[PDB]
Design a protein around this ligand. Structure first.
Ligand SMILES: [Mg+2]
Lengths: 103, 54, 52, 346, 22, 56, 53, 112, 101, 366, 214, 181, 187
């Protein structure tokens, strides 16, 4: 979030509503309303697939993408990684050192 | 007296069972609260049914 | 005898006969005088038997 | 090696430190409506310093210095009224504490006035905290029984009970604390990790508030001579503590010492469904919505509701023997026609 | 071994169920 | 040769009883089930007929 | 025949006080009564609450 | 229960011969690998090719493997057609390809 | 014959990199051997402070109990006092007066 | 990979196309948006009353002990059990009454069930014993063969001296180190093991599985299992009339044919047995939960020419009821003859299970 | 804990909080709600079962990890291979079985042919069976009656049959007529004082088999 | 709880008590075929604070009266030398016990003692109770009241109490008999 | 022959006077169970002996009229197993009939000594926990003997009562209206 605008634009979630691996379905049932009520501007696109990719993707406003792996991962962990997506801006990757404390 | 590391026990197994007994006494406090509630309710029901029959 | 007398004094009215019998058996085991053993057996009989 | 803990020892990270949310009242139901259905039949403020002052005030109230607690509460309540907008949670909570201090000092009329103002602020609020409303009307009941309104005090305690039985979740407090005994891998030493216990009076303060409400209600009923009311309140208290214990219940995993397999804690620490939510959303009562638009299988009658395709030709059933010789292919001859007549349209 | 090895194309002694001890 | 419980072989209620069948599968198709019943009946009938022929 | 002539409407078993009924069982039992059994409202109909049919 | 059945001998693990193992543990044959598609350690898993292992398949698609190797003419009778299991059957559609058009993924005829 | 593969420990204080011995407050091997010998000797002396209490036949070790019982069951079948069997095995003589004696 | 691994989250891009397909993808409307498949509990098989319909008077509810009748209906004739009802340590302690279905998909009457059979509350350890035994047994043991070093057909002579050339020291070089050699301890059918199952545990686990099916509500009692003609089309017509999804993908059916109520039999009906052979998810099993005591006449490897796994030489036949098949097949159809046979075979078992002060009252009660 | 509602705490996960797999139904969950038992994978064995052996119990080192260090274990190799050592006690002194003499050519407690080694039968056990209802006191009790009432298992029946021992009994309340072998004098006296009768039916092997299989 | 040998050596007890110092008091041992109930153990149980009432030791002990009866009538409760009696039921009718303890086929109580790693014959033992029906957790709480310092686990089939011997089994059987099982 | 409860030839030779015995009432429940299972065993033996071939396949349909047992094995089976089972069943019947006669004598003596109702009450084997096995609906208020204890009417208050409703737009699916509770997810 910079000057009152979120750098995260879209959240791609892909899941299978019928076969197995119910972690993403649990997440969609319990934590997704909370995340949506917390961040209304972020558009979340759900993709029902037969063989879904067990991963969560975040598309930012500068055209960047960040994907986390969610294979056999708890819905709490999925929620944590989604909050990581909405928190980071995905614009740089700098170390935490004395010469890098000041941008 | 329950401040951190309450004592010096002669063995870490004694320390382990002291912590275990602390947790057991907590659980027993809760169980005894519930059981005292049940006993008081039972005595009240007994007295009430006796006074109603009489 | 002190231990067993305390047990007898603090025993439940439904467990007094068994504790008196245990006292008599303990006296017989520790080889107390025969009069002590007989007195304890008589006390046990007094507590156990209804007509005695 | 034993640890003396002489130097500064940083705490350990344990799942009991999870930030538990607050039970909120639904937006539709209102405390005003509950009371009516019962009667039917920001600027800058040094909040750190005022929090020091409020902590000192509640320390005075717990130690028994009621006038000092009252003046501390008044100062911090002025600060909160300036720092927060109308009908705020911290505002109504601090004036709850203020009414309690008034009642303890003996200004019962002002205590009742402040607690009624708390009630109207709760009614004006949108989704107030269940703990907040329970504590507010508990203070209301205690003030009423101090004034001499014992029936109204019992009514307040009973409405606490009826709110906590209808809007409070009894299993959410020990969702992440229930499978913790499965982390212990040693049986000879450090075996208290298999018997770790967390009292509900520390992780569910609404439970303790309603417990005190029911205790005071039972005391008042015993003083008045209402055996029926005393029995009712004791039954409800027993039911509440039984619900709490049941939501804390769990079976035992491995008993003895396990070496290795440290990556099992990922499975141990999870959003394990509490007994309450399990029995609530059992997959038979709370059924899973299953739309066949995104599926390749459907019931016998609803064949056309399957996911669509372009130029779909039903070849046959995938008889794994069709790859074999002519005799096997002759044996798998009429199965397709019979399957078609079996799944024909009604 | 290999699928079509000369070592297994030709026959050899075949091991049997060993007898247990007393 | 050796000792085998001939006194138990053929004593069950059906042909599949007391048969050392260790060549099966956790799922049997229609053909597999038909062949299983066929092989059980064939085992029983071959045993009986061979014994009768040898005796006669 | 005797039992069906005696009982036109379902008995106490036709209640939702503890849980929902089963449409399959209702469609199998339809032939035993005169009223429509399988037609269930969305509300958990209770015996003593509202008179059925 | 006298010596309950072993979990490792449940037929759900045919592993490489390791240092540890029971006498009743059926490991993979000598010279044979445990995973079929792992020719090398960097070999990928085939996307739609499925090798039926263990029991006989209930529904065998023409492009799946069962006691057989991959032959193009046998596993792909028509390369423009895509077979699938719809309502316990072999239903064949026109194979398609996803292409970006106007910001969305659109299905076009794969052969064309 | 000690562990050549040194045990590794999670280093929480930088002085654990310097310390070689795990428990420095614990006596050395031979010192604690001597300490254990001395403590066991003191416990044995405390146990033998009172004399050797003579024991009846039922509270005997198994390798003496039944032998001593069979050595005199014949004489015990006939109830008369003063019958003694001088069995070879049993408790040895203390050599001094004993309060239990 | 493992979650506690660096290679778990090393895929940063390329997993999802930024563009969504215009056929199935949608956006999240909000909390009131009912998402297909979403459920709070972890359900690896998220089915409902439409995909996997239950056949019972009520939908299994937590407020009900079982999804069946607890008292006989005054409009349906009630048939008690063939043997009297006794409640042992594991029974549900509540009356179980199930409707008997006519082959026209109609409820003709109702019948009491036995808690010892369908009331033995399930336990995961017993069901796991059952399933593990069934899988380890149903494995094929003849294909467990493998070559040994003494089965390689190479010259029994040292190929080259150990100190002569730069090659390593080796002799016959027919061992596992070489691609053509075999192992010292290879897999053999006679070295493999077949587990032993005791009658007590087998019967207990089978009755627990029956109780689990009854609790889930997928147990259906019919009067007969007969076909007018022994063909497959008559069987498929019966399945279509009874709404039995015997397809390879639908919820399968497990039949237990024991005959009629008046005419029970231990042999399957000939017409229905000839018609039931269909390439789908349907299996017919014997009307019994017990099993023969398993033996082993080669426990010490006395007969060396034995070809077959160590352990029980009398394993459970394939057509027997088991936890694996019960889990694989959704609905369980049982006949009244099969019910009678189960009761007759378990009567003496439950009577011997009974305690003594209650056993002494059996002739008193009758 | 949040001080104010307006300033909640961030959701920024930790390792212990995020690195968590999905929940698999356990024994308590499946026992509490049997509706979620939907697959064969739910039927897991006893939780005391960890799994297959995943390491090497290398002696004097502990349970070492596979692929770890092997340079400090040859006792583990001598444990795998049946080859053994241990002459540290034999270098000077002779073994105890070489030092101890032999009391007889057969040894102590030698079970020679026809030694009359009876399996014990508790008189308390017999009285418990009688009071329970397994054994009918109206008839003469024999070893056949015991075996049929299942008071003793066939594992225990070895020639010669049994011996009645009065362990834990000082008084028999009812008269009992029993046939056994070599009952103790005290048990015989107890039965006679109660009013019953004992008969030492010392039979041969053929007689025992005929009494057990009439 | 007096050291008889110490008192003899000090002069507080006569030297004839060496048999009491060496051997325990001769008492009928408690076994599975002989319920030799102990009045002292039952008195300790009655003095312990529990939630449910316990029957009287007189009702627990079988009726010991004159044996002048010619025919042994098959009454529910009769004289037994081994102390066998059917369950007596609850002590107070106005109560509900959250658990039910079934008896074996021979009338034995479910208390069964095992060992930790019995292959090496290790002297560490535990008790397994695997016939309790109802609220196994309430049974476990009562077991916590009985044995405060022991480790108790509970499963759907059995309840384990670790580090309790045949004496612990006897105490458990006494408590169950007093409760009414 | 000691199979019956009279005594063996060894006791006859010994001359032990065990003829006058204390007639005590004995219901013979274990013996009745054993007789039931022995009767079933005899019937099953007759069935397995009389099993004849009935093959459903043409390859095996050549011997559809014969016994599955060869005549020699059929004779041996009938001579050992069938008639040994019959003899065991007869032994059980004899023992139970003897005990029934003794019980009739005891009942007569008790009736002439005390009275009909008194003798019936003294001979009744009813235990205060017999309802826990024969009619648990009368034992519910005594103790909680349910495997699912949470559903017992005494502990039934803990089971939650959701507010379910049918949704026609979802296909008659029942769905619970209770809103979920927020879970602790970070620390
Ligand atoms: Mg010898």
């Amino acid at each position: 979030s910079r000057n009152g605008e979120l750098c995260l634009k879209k959240v791609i979630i892909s899941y299978c509503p019928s076969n197995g691996a119910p972690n993403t379905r649990q997440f969609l049932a319990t934590h997704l309303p909370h995340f949506h009520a917390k961040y209304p501007s972020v558009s979340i696109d759900l993709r029902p697939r037969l063989w879904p990719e067990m991963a969560i993707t975040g598309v930012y406003r500068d055209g960047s993408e960040r994907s986390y792996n969610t294979k056999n991962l708890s819905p709490m962990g999925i929620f944590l990684r989604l909050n990581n997506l909405v928190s980071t801006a995905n614009d740089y990757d700098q170390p935490f050192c004395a010469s890098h404390l000041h941008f | 007296p329950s401040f951190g590391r309450v004592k010096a026990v002669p063995s870490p197994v004694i320390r382990s069972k002291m912590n275990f007994m602390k947790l057991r006494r907590m659980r027993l406090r809760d169980v005894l609260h519930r059981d005292a509630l049940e006993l008081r309710l039972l005595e009240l029901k007994r007295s009430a049914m006796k006074n109603x029959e009489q | 005898h002190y231990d067993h007398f305390l047990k007898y004094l603090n025993a439940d009215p439904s467990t007094v006969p068994x504790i008196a019998q245990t006292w008599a058996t303990t006296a017989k085991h520790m080889r107390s005088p025969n009069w002590i053993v007989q007195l304890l057996r008589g006390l046990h009989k007094y507590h156990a038997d209804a007509e005695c | 090696v034993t640890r003396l803990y002489t130097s500064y020892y940083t705490g350990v990270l344990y799942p009991n430190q999870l930030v538990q949310p607050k039970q909120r009242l639904p937006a539709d139901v209102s405390v005003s409506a509950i009371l009516q259905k019962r009667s039917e039949p920001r600027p800058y403020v040094p909040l750190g310093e005022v929090a020091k002052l409020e902590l000192q005030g509640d320390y005075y109230m717990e130690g028994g210095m009621f006038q000092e607690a009252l003046e501390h509460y008044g100062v911090v309540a002025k600060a909160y009224n300036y720092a927060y907008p109308e009908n705020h949670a911290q505002r109504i909570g601090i004036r709850i504490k203020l009414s309690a201090a008034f009642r303890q000092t003996g200004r019962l009329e002002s205590s009742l006035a402040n607690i009624e103002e708390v009630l109207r602020m709760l009614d004006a609020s949108t989704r107030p905290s269940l703990e907040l409303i329970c504590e507010a009307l508990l203070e209301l009941g205690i003030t009423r029984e101090a004034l001499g309104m014992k029936r109204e005090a019992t009514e307040a305690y009973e409405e606490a009970l009826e709110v906590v039985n209808s809007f409070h979740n009894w299993g959410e407090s020990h969702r992440m604390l229930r499978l913790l005994p499965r982390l212990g891998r040693r049986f000879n030493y450090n075996f208290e990790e298999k018997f770790v216990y967390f009292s509900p009076f520390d992780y569910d303060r609404t439970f303790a508030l309603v417990d005190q409400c029911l205790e005071r209600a039972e005391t008042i009923f015993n003083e008045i001579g209402d055996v029926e009311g005393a029995i009712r309140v004791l039954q409800q208290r027993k039911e509440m503590i039984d619900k709490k214990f049941f939501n804390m219940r769990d079976f035992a995993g491995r008993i003895h010492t396990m070496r290795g397999h440290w990556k099992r804690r990922a499975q141990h620490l999870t959003n394990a469904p509490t007994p309450d939510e399990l029995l609530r959303y059992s997959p038979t009562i709370h059924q899973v919505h299953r739309d066949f638009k995104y599926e390749l299988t459907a019931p016998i009658g609803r064949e056309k509701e399957v996911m669509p395709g372009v130029n779909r030709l039903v070849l046959d059933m995938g008889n794994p023997y069709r790859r074999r010789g002519r005799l096997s292919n002759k044996m798998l001859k009429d199965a397709d026609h019979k399957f078609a007549n079996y799944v024909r349209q009604k | 071994p290999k699928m079509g090895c000369e070592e297994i194309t030709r026959k050899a002694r075949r091991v049997q169920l060993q007898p247990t001890e007393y | 040769g050796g000792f085998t419980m001939k006194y138990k072989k053929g004593t069950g209620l059906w042909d599949e009883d007391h048969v050392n069948d260790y060549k099966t599968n956790r799922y049997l198709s229609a053909r597999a089930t038909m062949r299983w019943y066929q092989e059980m009946e064939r085992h029983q009938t071959r045993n009986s007929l061979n014994a009768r022929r040898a005796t006669q | 025949g005797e039992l069906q002539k005696k009982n036109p409407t379902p008995s106490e078993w036709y209640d939702e006080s503890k849980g929902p009924l089963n449409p399959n069982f209702l469609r199998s039992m339809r032939s035993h009564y005169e009223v429509d059994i399988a037609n269930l409202p969305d509300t958990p109909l209770i015996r003593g609450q509202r008179e059925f049919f | 229960m006298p010596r309950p059945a072993p979990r490792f001998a449940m037929g759900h693990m045919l592993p490489h011969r390791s240092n540890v193992g029971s006498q009743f543990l059926h490991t993979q044959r000598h010279g044979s690998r445990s995973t079929w598609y792992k020719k090398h350690y960097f070999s990928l898993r085939p996307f739609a090719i499925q090798r039926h292992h263990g029991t006989t398949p209930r529904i065998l698609l023409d492009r799946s493997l069962w006691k057989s190797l991959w032959i193009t003419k046998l596993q792909l009778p028509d390369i423009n057609r895509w077979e699938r299991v719809v309502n316990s059957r072999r239903v064949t559609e026109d194979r398609y390809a996803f292409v970006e058009e106007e910001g969305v993924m659109h299905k076009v005829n794969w052969g064309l | 014959a000690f562990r050549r593969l040194v045990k590794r420990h999670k280093i929480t204080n930088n002085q654990m990199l310097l310390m070689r011995r795990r428990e420095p407050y614990k006596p050395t091997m031979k010192d604690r051997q001597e300490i254990a010998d001395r403590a066991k000797l003191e416990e044995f002396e405390r146990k033998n402070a009172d004399g050797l209490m003579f024991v009846p036949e039922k509270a005997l070790p198994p390798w003496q109990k039944s032998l001593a019982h069979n050595a005199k069951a014949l004489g015990s079948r006939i109830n008369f006092r003063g019958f003694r069997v001088r069995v070879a095995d049993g408790q040895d003589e203390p050599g001094f007066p004993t309060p239990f004696r | 990979s493992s979650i506690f691994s660096p290679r778990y989250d090393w895929r940063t891009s390329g997993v999802h196309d930024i563009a969504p397909r215009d056929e199935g993808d949608f956006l999240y409307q909000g909390p009131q948006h009912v998402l297909p498949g979403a459920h709070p509990l972890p359900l690896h098989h998220p089915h409902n009353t439409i995909t996997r319909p239950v056949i019972s008077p009520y939908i299994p509810s937590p407020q009900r002990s079982h999804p069946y009748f607890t008292a006989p209906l005054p409009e349906l004739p009630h048939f008690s059990t063939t043997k009297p009802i006794v409640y042992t340590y594991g029974t549900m302690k509540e009356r179980i009454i199930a409707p008997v279905f006519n082959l026209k998909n109609e409820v003709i009457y109702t019948r009491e069930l036995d808690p010892f059979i369908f009331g033995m509350y399930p336990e995961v350890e017993e069901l796991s014993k059952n399933l593990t035994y069934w899988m380890v047994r149903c494995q094929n043991f003849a294909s467990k063969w493998d070559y040994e070093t003494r089965e390689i057909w190479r010259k029994a002579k040292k190929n080259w001296p150990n100190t002569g050339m730069g090659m390593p020291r080796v002799g016959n070089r027919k061992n596992h180190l070489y691609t053509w050699g075999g192992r010292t301890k290879p897999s053999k059918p006679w070295n493999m093991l077949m587990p032993t199952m005791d009658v007590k545990t087998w019967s207990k686990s089978n009755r627990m599985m029956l109780t689990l099916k009854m609790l889930q509500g997928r147990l259906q009692v019919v009067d007969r299992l007969t076909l007018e003609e022994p063909t497959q089309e008559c069987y498929l017509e019966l399945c279509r009339n009874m709404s039995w999804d015997v397809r390879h993908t639908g919820g399968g059916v497990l039949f237990m044919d024991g005959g009629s109520r008046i005419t029970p039999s231990s042999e399957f009906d000939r017409a229905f047995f000839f018609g039931s052979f269909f390439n789908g998810r349907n299996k017919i099993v014997r009307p019994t939960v017990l099993c023969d005591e398993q033996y082993d006449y080669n426990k010490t490897a006395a007969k060396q020419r034995m070809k077959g796994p160590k352990g029980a030489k009398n394993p459970i036949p394939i057509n027997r009821f088991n936890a694996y098949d019960a889990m694989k097949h959704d609905r369980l159809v049982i006949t009244e003859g099969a019910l009678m046979q189960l009761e007759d075979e378990l009567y003496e078992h439950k009577l011997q299970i009974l305690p003594p002060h209650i056993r002494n009252q059996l002739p008193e009660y009758g | 804990k949040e001080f104010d509602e307006d300033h909640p705490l961030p959701v920024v996960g930790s390792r212990l909080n995020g690195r968590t797999t999905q929940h698999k139904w356990n024994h308590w969950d499946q026992y509490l709600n049997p509706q979620i038992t939907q697959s064969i994978k739910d039927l897991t064995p006893t939780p005391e079962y960890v799994g297959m052996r995943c390491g090497h119990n290398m002696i004097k080192m502990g349970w070492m990890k596979i692929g770890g260090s092997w340079k400090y274990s040859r006792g583990y190799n001598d444990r795998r291979r049946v080859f053994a050592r241990g002459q540290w006690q034999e270098r000077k002194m002779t073994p105890r079985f070489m030092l101890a003499p032999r009391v007889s050519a057969g040894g102590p407690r030698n079970r020679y042919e026809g030694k009359l080694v009876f399996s014990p039968l508790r008189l308390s056990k017999l009285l418990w069976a009688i009071d329970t209802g397994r054994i009918n006191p109206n008839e003469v009790i024999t070893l056949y009656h015991l075996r049929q009432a299942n008071v003793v298992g066939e594992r225990e029946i070895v020639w010669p049959g049994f011996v009645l021992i009065s362990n834990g009994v000082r008084r028999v309340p009812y008269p009992i007529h029993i046939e056994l072998q070599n009952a103790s004098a005290e048990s015989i006296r107890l039965i006679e004082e109660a009013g019953g009768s004992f008969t030492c039916v010392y039979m041969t092997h053929e007689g025992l088999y005929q009494e057990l299989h009439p | 709880p007096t050291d008889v040998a110490a008192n003899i050596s000090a002069g507080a007890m006569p030297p004839e008590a060496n048999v009491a110092a060496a051997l325990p008091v001769p008492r009928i041992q408690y076994s599975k075929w002989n319920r030799a109930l102990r009045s002292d153990v039952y008195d300790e149980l009655l003095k312990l604070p529990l939630r449910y009432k316990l029957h009287d030791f007189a009702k627990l002990c079988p009726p010991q009266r004159c044996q002048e009866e010619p025919e042994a009538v098959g009454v529910v409760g009769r004289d037994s030398a081994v102390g066998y009696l059917p369950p007596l039921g609850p002590a107070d009718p106005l109560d509900t016990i959250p658990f039910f303890v079934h008896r074996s086929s021979n009338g034995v109580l479910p208390g069964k003692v095992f060992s930790m790693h019995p292959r090496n014959l290790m002297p560490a033992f535990y008790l397994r109770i695997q016939q309790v029906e109802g609220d196994m957790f309430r049974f476990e709480e009562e077991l916590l009241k009985i044995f405060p310092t022991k480790k108790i686990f509970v499963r759907s089939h059995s309840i384990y109490v670790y580090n309790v011997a045949l004496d612990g089994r006897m105490v458990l059987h006494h408590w169950l008999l007093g409760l009414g099982f | 022959s000691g199979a019956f409860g009279c005594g063996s030839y060894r006791s006859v030779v010994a001359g032990t006077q065990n003829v006058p015995r204390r007639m005590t009432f004995y219901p013979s429940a274990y013996e009745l169970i054993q007789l039931h299972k022995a009767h079933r065993e005899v019937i099953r033996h007759f069935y397995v002996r009389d099993k004849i071939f009935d093959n459903k396949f043409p390859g095996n349909a050549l011997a559809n009229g014969l016994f599955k047992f060869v005549p020699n094995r059929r004779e041996n089976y009938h001579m050992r197993e069938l008639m040994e089972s019959i003899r065991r069943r007869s032994i059980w019947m004899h023992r139970i009939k003897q005990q029934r006669e003794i019980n009739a004598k005891v009942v007569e003596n008790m009736e002439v000594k005390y009275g009909k109702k008194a003798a019936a009450s003294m001979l009744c084997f009813t235990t205060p926990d017999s309802n826990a096995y024969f009619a648990p609906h009368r034992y519910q208020d005594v103790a909680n003997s349910w495997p699912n204890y949470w559903q017992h009417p005494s502990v039934n208050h803990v089971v939650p009562k959701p507010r379910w409703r049918r949704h026609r737009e979802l296909g008659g699916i029942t769905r619970v209206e209770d809103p979920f509770a927020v879970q602790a997810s970070d620390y």
